Amino acid sequence: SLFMSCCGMAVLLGIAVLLSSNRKAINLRTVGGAFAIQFSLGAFILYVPWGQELLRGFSDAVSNVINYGNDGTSFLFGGLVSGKMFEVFGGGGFIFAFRVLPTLIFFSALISVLYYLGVMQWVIRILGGGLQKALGTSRAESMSAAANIFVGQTEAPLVVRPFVPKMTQSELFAVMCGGLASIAGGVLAGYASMGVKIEYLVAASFMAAPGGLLFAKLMMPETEKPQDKPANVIDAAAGGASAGLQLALNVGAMLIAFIGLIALINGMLGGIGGWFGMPELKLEMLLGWLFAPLAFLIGVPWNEATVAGEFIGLKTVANEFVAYSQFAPYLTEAAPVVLSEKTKAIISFALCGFANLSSIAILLGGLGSLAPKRRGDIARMGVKAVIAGTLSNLMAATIAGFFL
Amino acid sequence: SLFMSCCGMAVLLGIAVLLSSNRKAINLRTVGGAFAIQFSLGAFILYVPWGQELLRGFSDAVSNVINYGNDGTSFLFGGLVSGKMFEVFGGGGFIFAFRVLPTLIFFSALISVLYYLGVMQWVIRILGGGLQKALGTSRAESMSAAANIFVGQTEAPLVVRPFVPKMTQSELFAVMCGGLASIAGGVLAGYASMGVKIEYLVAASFMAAPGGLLFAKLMMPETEKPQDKPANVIDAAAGGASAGLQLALNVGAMLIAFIGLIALINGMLGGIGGWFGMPELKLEMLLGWLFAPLAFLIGVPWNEATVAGEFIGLKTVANEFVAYSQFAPYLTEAAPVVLSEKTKAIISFALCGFANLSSIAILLGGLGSLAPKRRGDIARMGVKAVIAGTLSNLMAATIAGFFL
Amino acid sequence: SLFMSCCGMAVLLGIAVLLSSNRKAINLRTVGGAFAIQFSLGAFILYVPWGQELLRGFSDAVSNVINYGNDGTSFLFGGLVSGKMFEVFGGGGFIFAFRVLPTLIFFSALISVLYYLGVMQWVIRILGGGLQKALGTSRAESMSAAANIFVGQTEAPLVVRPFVPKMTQSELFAVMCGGLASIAGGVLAGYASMGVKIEYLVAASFMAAPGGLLFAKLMMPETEKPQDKPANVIDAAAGGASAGLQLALNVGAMLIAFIGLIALINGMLGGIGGWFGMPELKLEMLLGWLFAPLAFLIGVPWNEATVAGEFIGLKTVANEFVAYSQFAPYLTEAAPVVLSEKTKAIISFALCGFANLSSIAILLGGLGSLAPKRRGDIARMGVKAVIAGTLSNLMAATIAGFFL
Ligand SMILES: CCCCCCCCCCO[C@@H]1O[C@H](CO)[C@@H](O[C@H]2O[C@H](CO)[C@@H](O)[C@H](O)[C@H]2O)[C@H](O)[C@H]1O
Ligand SMILES: CCCCCCCCCCO[C@@H]1O[C@H](CO)[C@@H](O[C@H]2O[C@H](CO)[C@@H](O)[C@H](O)[C@H]2O)[C@H](O)[C@H]1O
Ligand SMILES: CCCCCCCCCCO[C@@H]1O[C@H](CO)[C@@H](O[C@H]2O[C@H](CO)[C@@H](O)[C@H](O)[C@H]2O)[C@H](O)[C@H]1O
Ligand SMILES: O=c1[nH]c(=O)n([C@@H]2O[C@H](CO)[C@@H](O)[C@H]2O)cc1F
Ligand SMILES: O=c1[nH]c(=O)n([C@@H]2O[C@H](CO)[C@@H](O)[C@H]2O)cc1F
Ligand SMILES: O=c1[nH]c(=O)n([C@@H]2O[C@H](CO)[C@@H](O)[C@H]2O)cc1F
Ligand code: NA
Ligand code: NA
Ligand code: NA
C-alpha cells in the first residue's frame, strides 16, 4: 500500500546520507524542515481540497497565458498551426517545431517583462525569505532556490550575482542543486504544449525549491560560515524574445540530433543483440530493465515499472526534454501502453528536472561566468550535484504518488 | 480642406521649435531648405506627372527584384510557398515566416553586393552632396542621412565611420535622427510583401533624408564647429546573407513574442476594463483613443482617425514592424474596416520609420561601437531623437495626404 | 576512346607543373605516388569487383545512418516530411529546408561523438600514416589530408593544431589544399539526400586525400625542412548538434540569397543580352559556354559538355552546394536534359569539393585562428590553393570517367 512509498522516501534519504560529505555536520533543522516543507507542499496542493483548487487555478492561468502567446505563433506560421493540418496529415498535423518551440520564445519574453516590472523579484523575495527563516539556510542560496521555480539553472543565480564568488562550498553546491532539481518557465510551457499536465509541472517546480535544498544540505552540509537592466519594458521583452529564440534553436537542434542518434543506437543494438539471440534489443529496453527497480521503489506498480523506467532512465542519461518527447505519446488516446493515472503522475514528476550530466557543462559556463575563480569547484561537485538533483525529482515523484 | 494639412505641418514644426535646445541658434537656411526639399520631393513624385512616373518605374523595378529573390525562397520551402497553400488553407496558406522573412536575407545580400561594387556609395555621394550644398549641413551627417534611405540606422553611419567619434553633438543627433526617421531596404521589401504599397515605402524612404535633417536641426541646431571590405563579390553576398539571416531570426522572434504579449495584455485589459463596465477593452482601443487626435491633425478623416490611431500608436509604443503586421489586413479585400485610399497612404507613410524607444538601445550598440566614448551622448539624446524621428514620419504623412 | 581521358589527366598535371613555385623542387616520389594512389584507389573501388563491393557496402551503411538520423527530423517537422506532402504538393512536397538541412545537424553531432570515442582519430591515424610512408609527406599534413575525407576544411587541421603555427609554407599550402579538394561528412549526407549517388560522394571524398597532396606538392613543393574535449559523450553530441545548426542556418541563408541573386542576374542578362540579339541570355549559358571545353577535356561527351559546364562553372564561381542544387533535378526522372550515366558521374565527382574563392575567407578565419601569425601566408596562397583544389576535383572526375 502506502508503505512502499514511505520506504521509497526513506531509501532516497538514506542514499543522500550515505553520500554525504559529512553526516555529523548535517543540520537536522535544515534537512528536517526541508523535507517537511516539500512533503507538506505536496500534501497541500495534491490532497487538501483548498490547495488542490489553488493549484488548479494557477495552472489554468498558465494555460491561458500559453494560448495568448500562441497568437504570435499563429501569425508567423498561419495555416501550418491550424486545425486543417489535422485533416490533411492526421496525427502528423501537429508540427512540433511550430507548435512547441515558439512557446519558449514567448515565455522568455514574458519572464523578462515580469523581471523588469519587479513582479518576479517580489515573489522570489517572499518565497526565498520563508525558506531561510524555516531552514536556517543562507539568504543568497534561499533566493536562488526560489528563483529556480520560475527560471532556469543559469538564470536563477542572477538574483544573487554579487554574492556568488564568495559563497561557501555548501552554498555553491545548493545553488547548483536548485537548478538541477528544477526546470524553467519557458520549457514548462513547452512540456505542457506536448500534453504534460500543467498541474504536475507547476507542482514539481514549487516542490523543487525545498527539495533542492534538502538533498544539497544532506549531501553537502554547511561546514563554513556564510556572509551577509533594460532601458524600458519594451527592451525587456525584446531581450527575452532573443534569449528564447536561441534556446528554441538549441533545443530543436538537440532533439533532431539526439532522437536521430537514439535511432542509430537502436539499429546497432539490433545487430549486437542479435548475436545473443536478442535482435529486438533497443535502448528503451536497456533503460527500462535498468531503471525498473528505481521506478518500483518510488511507487510505480510492478506491471508498469519497466515502461516507467524507460523514460526515467532516458531523462537521466540524456535530458528531460528528450524523455518527455518519448513519454508524451503515452498521454494521448493513441498511447502504445495505457498507464495508470498514478504512474503517469509519477513519471511526470520524476522527469521534471534539469538533473543530467550535460547540465554540468551548462552550469560551468553560466554559473561559472558569475564567478570565474569557482569553476574548479563547480566541476568538482558536478556529479554529486546531479545526483542530489535526481534524488530531489525522485522524492517529489514519490510524494506525488503517495497522495494519489 | 487642405487647410487642415497645412495646420498639421505647422503644428509639427512648432512642436520641434518648442523642444529645441536653442531656438535662436536655428539656421533658417538649413531648416527652411530641408522642409522645402521634403515638401518638393513629395510634390514631385506624388503630384507632378513625370515624378509620379519615375516613382512608379522605380517601384516596379523593386517589385521585380523581390520576385527574383523569391526564387531562392521557393527553392528552400517548395510547396509551402506555392499556390496550393491557398487551396488547402485558404487565407492561412500565406505563411509569414516563409513568405516575408526570407526576403530580408536576399535583400541584405543584394545591398552588400551593391556596396562591394560601389553602386551604393555612388548614389549616396550624389544625394548626400546635394543635401549639404543646399542646407549647409556638414559632409558626414549629409551622407549618413542619404545612406539611411537604403540601409538601416546602424549601417548608414558606416559610410562616415572615422568621422563619428569627433562629431559635434548636433551632428551625432542628426545621424541618430536620420536612422530613426527611416527604415531599411531589407524590411521595405518585407513590408511590400505584406501588401504595403511599394510607392509609399520608396517615397517615405527618400523623404526621410531631408525630413530627418529638418527636425534634427530644429530640435538640435549646430552650436559647435564641425570638421572636414570583403575579398570578392561572392564573399560580399555571403556576408549580407548572414547578416540578413540574423535580422530575419530577430524579427521573427520579436513578432512571436510581441504579438503574443499584446494578446495577453488584451486578456488582462478585458478583466480590468470589466471593473469599469468595459469588458471589451483592448490595447488597440487605448492606442486608437489616444492617437486619434494626432491622426486627425495629419489629415486623417474624422471617421477614420481612431482606426488610424491604433496603428500609429502601436508603431510608436513598440515598432513599425508590429504596426504593419496589424495594418496589413486593412490593405486586402478582407479588411475589417474599409479605409479611404488617402487614409491608407497616410498610415503607410506615418508608420515608415524606425522611430521608437527600443531603437535607442539599438543605436547605443551599433552606432556606439563606432564611437565608444560617445555612448553617454547617445543615451542622453535618445528620447529627443526618437521624437524628432517621429515628427519626420508624421510630416511625411501629412505631405503625402496633402497631394492626395 | 580512353585516350581523351588520359590526355585530360596529362593536361591537368601539366597546368599544375606550369603553375609550380619551383618545378625543379618537385619530388617525383611524392607527386608520382600521390597520383598512383588516387588512380589506383579509383581503379579499385570503381572497376575492380571487390573494391566496388566494399564501396557499395560502405555507401549503404552511410545510407542507413541517414535514414536513422531522419527520425529526429520526422519528430520535429512531422507531416511536413511525410509521404502526404507528395500527394498534396506533388514534386513541391519535397521541402528542402526540412529534408536536407536537418541532416547537417544530425551528422555533425555524430561526427563529434565519433571523435569523443576515438573512432575518427583511429581511422585518420591509419590513413594519414599510410600516406606519409608512401609519399614522404610530413606527419602533420598527411593527417590533415586524411581527416579532410570525413570533416570540413576548418575542422580537419584540428587534429594537428599545435603543429600548424610552425608549418612550412608547403605544409600550410597542402593543409589548405586538403580542405579545398574535399567536402565534409555533414554536407555529403545533404547532397546524398538531394539525389546525388552516395558511392560517388564517398569515392570522391577518399580520393581527395591523395589528390589534394598531389596538386599541392606539384604547385608548391617542399623547399624547407618540416618538424616532428567535451566532458562526456552526451556533451560531445550536443556540441556537434549546435555546430551543425549554425552550419544549417548558414547554408540555408546562403542558398536563399545566391539562388535569388542568380535569378536577378538572369533577369538583367535578359535585357543586356537583348541588346545583342540574345534576350534568352542567362548565367547558365555563360558558364556552360565557358566551361564546356573543360568538361570535354575531363571526359564529357561532346553533346553533353555544355550542360556539364553549367554546373562545373557554377561550383567554381560560387560553391558546390549551389551547383548541386541545380544539378540535382538532372538526377531524377523529371530531368530537363537526360544525361549519360558517365556524364552524371563526372559532374558528381567534379563538383565534390569546397574549391572556390569564398572558401579562402573561410580558411582565413578557421585555419587562421589556429595560427594568427600565418594569416598573411594563407591569403597569399589562397588563389593558388583554390586552383590546386579545383585540379584535384577535376582529376578525380577524369579518373572516374575513365573506369566508367
Ligand atoms: C542517449 C543514450 C545513450 C546514453 C549513454 C550514457 C552516457 C553516460 C556516460 C558519462 O560519462 C562520464 O560523464 C562524466 C560527467 O561529465 C565525466 O566526468 C567528467 O566531468 C565530471 C564532472 O565535473 C568530473 O567530476 C569528472 O572528473 C570528469 O571526468 C566522465 O569523464 C565521463 O566518463
Ligand atoms: C506594446 C504594447 C504596450 C506599450 C507600453 C508602453 C511602454 C513605454 C514606456 C517607456 O519607458 C521609458 O522608456 C525610456 C526610454 O528607454 C526610459 O528612459 C531611459 O532611457 C532614456 C534614453 O536614453 C534615458 O533618457 C532615460 O534617462 C532612461 O531612463 C525610461 O526609463 C522608461 O521609463
Ligand atoms: C554567382 C554567379 C556570378 C559569378 C561572378 C564571378 C565573380 C568572381 C570574381 C572574383 O574576384 C576576385 O576574387 C579574389 C579572391 O578573393 C580577390 O583576391 C583577393 O583575395 C586573394 C586571395 O587571398 C588575394 O590573393 C588577392 O590579393 C585579393 O585581391 C580579388 O580581389 C577579386 O577581384
Ligand atoms: O532554461 C534552460 N536552461 C538549461 O540549461 N536548459 C538545459 O537544456 C536541457 C533540456 O531542456 C536541460 O536538461 C538543461 O540542461 C534548458 C532550459 F530550458
Ligand atoms: O535594419 C534594421 N535595423 C534595425 O535596427 N531594425 C530595428 O528593428 C525594428 C523593427 O523593424 C525597427 O524599429 C528597428 O528598431 C530593423 C531593421 F530592419
Ligand atoms: O563544413 C563545412 N565547411 C565549410 O567551409 N563549408 C563552406 O560552405 C560552402 C558550401 O558547402 C563550401 O564551399 C565551403 O566553403 C561547408 C561545410 F559544410
Ligand atoms: Na530552475
Ligand atoms: Na535608414
Ligand atoms: Na574536408
XYZ file of N, CA and C in Angstrom, chain C residues 291-393:
309
model
N 32.787 26.762 -69.796
C 33.346 25.584 -69.139
C 33.157 24.301 -69.941
N 32.516 24.411 -71.101
C 32.337 23.264 -71.988
C 33.665 22.626 -72.426
N 34.671 23.441 -72.822
C 35.950 22.803 -73.160
C 36.558 22.028 -71.995
N 36.441 22.573 -70.789
C 36.986 21.923 -69.605
C 36.261 20.611 -69.314
N 34.946 20.610 -69.511
C 34.144 19.409 -69.315
C 34.497 18.352 -70.355
N 34.700 18.796 -71.590
C 35.052 17.897 -72.680
C 36.407 17.242 -72.428
N 37.317 18.003 -71.830
C 38.667 17.524 -71.559
C 38.689 16.418 -70.507
N 37.789 16.498 -69.531
C 37.777 15.524 -68.444
C 36.921 14.304 -68.779
N 36.414 14.247 -70.008
C 35.753 13.049 -70.493
C 34.269 13.147 -70.799
N 33.702 14.346 -70.710
C 32.284 14.519 -71.008
C 32.049 14.557 -72.512
N 31.135 13.704 -73.007
C 30.760 13.650 -74.424
C 30.448 15.028 -75.002
N 30.716 15.197 -76.293
C 30.592 16.487 -76.965
C 29.206 17.114 -76.824
N 28.169 16.288 -76.910
C 26.796 16.780 -76.862
C 26.292 17.015 -75.440
N 27.151 16.771 -74.456
C 26.778 16.952 -73.057
C 27.753 17.869 -72.325
N 28.734 18.393 -73.052
C 29.789 19.207 -72.453
C 29.282 20.569 -71.985
N 28.333 21.134 -72.723
C 27.801 22.457 -72.405
C 26.951 22.430 -71.136
N 26.086 21.425 -71.026
C 25.250 21.251 -69.843
C 26.109 20.932 -68.621
N 27.130 20.105 -68.823
C 28.057 19.758 -67.755
C 28.853 20.983 -67.318
N 29.101 21.882 -68.264
C 29.849 23.096 -67.993
C 29.107 24.058 -67.085
N 27.779 24.041 -67.167
C 26.942 24.903 -66.341
C 27.188 24.655 -64.858
N 27.184 23.385 -64.472
C 27.303 23.009 -63.071
C 28.733 23.153 -62.565
N 29.690 22.733 -63.387
C 31.104 22.835 -63.043
C 31.519 24.292 -62.862
N 31.052 25.153 -63.760
C 31.348 26.570 -63.670
C 30.713 27.208 -62.450
N 29.468 26.831 -62.176
C 28.729 27.377 -61.044
C 29.396 27.001 -59.724
N 29.900 25.775 -59.654
C 30.613 25.301 -58.476
C 31.865 26.134 -58.222
N 32.538 26.519 -59.301
C 33.782 27.274 -59.204
C 33.551 28.747 -58.873
N 32.580 29.368 -59.536
C 32.340 30.797 -59.356
C 31.541 31.090 -58.085
N 30.883 30.072 -57.540
C 30.114 30.239 -56.310
C 30.541 29.217 -55.260
N 29.832 28.092 -55.210
C 30.222 26.961 -54.373
C 29.517 25.688 -54.822
N 29.961 24.554 -54.293
C 29.479 23.260 -54.758
C 28.036 22.993 -54.333
N 27.600 23.623 -53.248
C 26.240 23.414 -52.763
C 25.220 23.966 -53.752
N 25.451 25.191 -54.211
C 24.572 25.816 -55.192
C 24.595 25.031 -56.500
N 25.779 24.557 -56.880
C 25.934 23.756 -58.088
C 25.111 22.477 -57.997
N 25.232 21.780 -56.870
C 24.461 20.563 -56.636
C 22.959 20.840 -56.631
N 22.571 22.037 -56.196
C 21.156 22.399 -56.133
C 20.554 22.525 -57.529
N 21.396 22.843 -58.507
C 20.948 22.988 -59.887
C 21.146 21.697 -60.679
N 22.025 20.830 -60.187
C 22.332 19.574 -60.862
C 21.412 18.441 -60.408
N 20.886 18.564 -59.192
C 20.013 17.543 -58.609
C 18.784 17.178 -59.464
N 18.089 18.175 -60.058
C 16.955 17.787 -60.909
C 17.345 16.913 -62.103
N 18.609 16.963 -62.508
C 19.079 16.172 -63.640
C 19.332 14.721 -63.240
N 19.143 14.421 -61.958
C 19.336 13.070 -61.443
C 18.003 12.364 -61.220
N 16.913 13.050 -61.545
C 15.579 12.484 -61.392
C 14.974 12.142 -62.748
N 13.771 11.579 -62.730
C 13.070 11.233 -63.961
C 12.521 12.483 -64.636
N 12.384 13.555 -63.860
C 11.886 14.822 -64.380
C 13.033 15.718 -64.835
N 14.128 15.095 -65.262
C 15.302 15.827 -65.719
C 15.024 16.538 -67.039
N 15.328 17.844 -67.101
C 15.121 18.622 -68.327
C 16.019 18.139 -69.461
N 17.186 17.610 -69.108
C 18.098 17.027 -70.086
C 18.613 15.680 -69.590
N 18.220 14.610 -70.274
C 18.668 13.272 -69.910
C 20.139 13.094 -70.256
N 20.967 12.949 -69.227
C 22.408 12.814 -69.410
C 22.846 11.361 -69.277
N 23.960 11.021 -69.919
C 24.517 9.680 -69.806
C 24.978 9.431 -68.378
N 25.019 8.163 -67.985
C 25.375 7.802 -66.621
C 26.835 8.136 -66.332
N 27.658 8.157 -67.377
C 29.060 8.526 -67.222
C 29.189 10.027 -66.990
N 28.392 10.808 -67.714
C 28.399 12.258 -67.562
C 27.882 12.654 -66.180
N 26.862 11.946 -65.703
C 26.340 12.161 -64.357
C 27.420 11.921 -63.306
N 28.222 10.884 -63.519
C 29.292 10.539 -62.592
C 30.406 11.581 -62.621
N 30.768 12.021 -63.821
C 31.827 13.011 -63.987
C 31.466 14.322 -63.295
N 30.236 14.779 -63.503
C 29.758 16.001 -62.870
C 29.746 15.857 -61.348
N 29.289 14.703 -60.865
C 29.226 14.429 -59.432
C 30.599 14.511 -58.765
N 31.604 13.930 -59.411
C 32.973 13.960 -58.903
C 33.594 15.352 -58.992
N 33.350 16.039 -60.104
C 33.969 17.336 -60.360
C 33.398 18.425 -59.456
N 32.205 18.179 -58.926
C 31.551 19.126 -58.031
C 31.897 18.862 -56.572
N 32.383 17.660 -56.284
C 32.577 17.242 -54.901
C 33.831 17.853 -54.281
N 33.767 19.144 -53.977
C 34.886 19.833 -53.360
C 34.524 21.234 -52.912
N 35.200 21.715 -51.873
C 34.977 23.063 -51.357
C 35.820 24.092 -52.108
N 36.411 23.672 -53.223
C 37.287 24.540 -54.002
C 36.525 25.686 -54.658
N 36.538 26.837 -53.996
C 36.017 28.073 -54.564
C 36.651 29.262 -53.856
N 36.504 30.448 -54.432
C 37.162 31.635 -53.902
C 36.665 31.994 -52.502
N 35.377 31.795 -52.249
C 34.804 32.138 -50.949
C 35.369 31.280 -49.818
N 35.877 30.100 -50.157
C 36.478 29.233 -49.151
C 37.792 29.804 -48.623
N 38.402 30.718 -49.376
C 39.622 31.377 -48.914
C 39.351 32.154 -47.628
N 38.269 32.929 -47.621
C 37.883 33.696 -46.439
C 37.571 32.770 -45.267
N 37.004 31.609 -45.579
C 36.713 30.601 -44.569
C 38.007 30.078 -43.953
N 38.980 29.761 -44.804
C 40.281 29.287 -44.345
C 41.003 30.349 -43.520
N 40.873 31.610 -43.925
C 41.485 32.719 -43.197
C 41.011 32.790 -41.749
N 39.732 32.501 -41.530
C 39.158 32.568 -40.200
C 39.424 31.326 -39.373
N 38.996 30.176 -39.883
C 39.134 28.919 -39.168
C 40.575 28.486 -38.996
N 41.265 28.286 -40.114
C 42.656 27.855 -40.087
C 43.552 28.954 -39.520
N 43.154 30.202 -39.736
C 43.913 31.341 -39.255
C 43.875 31.506 -37.748
N 42.794 31.052 -37.120
C 42.662 31.161 -35.670
C 43.620 30.202 -34.972
N 44.028 29.164 -35.696
C 44.970 28.173 -35.187
C 46.398 28.700 -35.246
N 46.614 29.697 -36.099
C 47.932 30.294 -36.274
C 47.793 31.715 -36.802
N 47.510 32.668 -35.902
C 47.213 34.059 -36.265
C 48.350 34.759 -37.011
N 49.587 34.319 -36.805
C 50.726 34.948 -37.466
C 50.935 34.418 -38.884
N 50.061 33.515 -39.320
C 50.193 32.911 -40.641
C 49.050 33.298 -41.577
N 48.208 34.230 -41.138
C 47.072 34.668 -41.944
C 47.524 35.338 -43.238
N 48.672 36.006 -43.189
C 49.242 36.624 -44.372
C 49.597 35.592 -45.425
N 50.160 34.471 -44.981
C 50.538 33.389 -45.885
C 49.314 32.722 -46.508
N 48.256 32.575 -45.718
C 47.025 31.951 -46.190
C 46.390 32.777 -47.303
N 46.299 34.085 -47.080
C 45.755 34.996 -48.079
C 46.629 35.024 -49.329
N 47.942 34.951 -49.131
C 48.889 34.988 -50.240
C 48.771 33.757 -51.135
N 48.484 32.610 -50.525
C 48.433 31.350 -51.256
C 47.005 30.922 -51.588
N 46.036 31.748 -51.201
C 44.628 31.425 -51.361
C 44.203 31.009 -52.758
N 44.479 31.861 -53.741
C 44.058 31.608 -55.117
C 44.701 30.344 -55.689
N 46.007 30.196 -55.484
C 46.720 29.009 -55.945
C 46.196 27.743 -55.271
N 45.809 27.865 -54.006
C 45.273 26.725 -53.268
C 43.925 26.304 -53.846
N 43.112 27.286 -54.223
C 41.820 27.019 -54.847
C 42.008 26.334 -56.199
N 42.985 26.808 -56.966
C 43.305 26.199 -58.252
C 43.730 24.746 -58.060
N 44.635 24.523 -57.112
C 45.095 23.178 -56.788
C 43.932 22.274 -56.387
N 43.015 22.812 -55.587
C 41.854 22.061 -55.146
C 40.918 21.744 -56.296
N 40.781 22.696 -57.213
C 39.956 22.512 -58.402
C 40.524 21.414 -59.300
N 41.839 21.434 -59.496
C 42.506 20.424 -60.312
C 42.333 19.033 -59.708
N 42.366 18.957 -58.382
C 42.195 17.685 -57.689
C 40.808 17.102 -57.946
N 39.784 17.948 -57.878
C 38.421 17.520 -58.176
C 38.280 17.087 -59.629
